[PDB]
Ligand binder design. Structure first.
Ligand SMILES: *[C@@H]1O[C@H](CO)[C@@H](O[C@@H]2O[C@H](CO)[C@@H](O)[C@H](O)[C@H]2NC(C)=O)[C@H](O)[C@H]1NC(C)=O
Ligand SMILES: *[C@@H]1O[C@H](CO)[C@@H](O[C@@H]2O[C@H](CO)[C@@H](O)[C@H](O)[C@H]2NC(C)=O)[C@H](O)[C@H]1NC(C)=O
Lengths: 48, 49
């Protein structure tokens, strides 16, 4: 059946977590680092 | 570099509580190298007036 095949395929995907634990933590760290740098970066005037 | 400290609540607290030679040195040096360097061309002009 195509319907149940579609559902099971949407559900079966490993996504992340197929990595090691060191690697997965390292990845989740740089994602937040990049997002935070973008969100709170600041530039300021060359004279004041 | 998204962690900027002011002098009053947070720099003279590092200088007053810490015991890490490197942390104290970073604070003492950066306060003079980043703020002291802006006051020099103003003090030289204030003396004259
Ligand atoms: C398997 O596929 C069939 C059709 O290929 C699905 O049959 C439908 O079932 C619904 C009710 O569940 C009916 O309203 C439709 O008329 C049926 N279609 C046909 C062409 O008869 C069946 O539902 C699928 N399996 C599951 C679990 O849904
Ligand atoms: C999803 O990831 C698992 C590993 O975490 C893949 O490996 C299979 O995992 C199942 C469940 O433990 C074992 O029974 C199999 O022997 C494993 N090896 C295979 C199937 O070669 C799994 O293949 C991944 N699935 C998808 C769809 O990517």
């Amino acid at each position: 059946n195509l319907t149940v095949k579609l559902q099971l395929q949407a559900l079966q995907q490993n996504g992340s977590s197929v990595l090691s634990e060191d690697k997965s933590k390292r990845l989740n760290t740089i994602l937040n680092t990049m997002s935070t740098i973008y969100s709170t970066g600041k530039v300021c005037n060359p004279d004041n | 570099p998204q962690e900027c400290l002011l002098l009053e609540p947070g720099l003279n607290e590092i200088m007053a509580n810490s015991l890490d030679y490197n942390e104290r040195l970073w604070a003492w040096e950066s306060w003079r190298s980043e703020v002291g360097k802006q006051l020099r061309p103003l003090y030289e002009e204030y003396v004259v007036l």
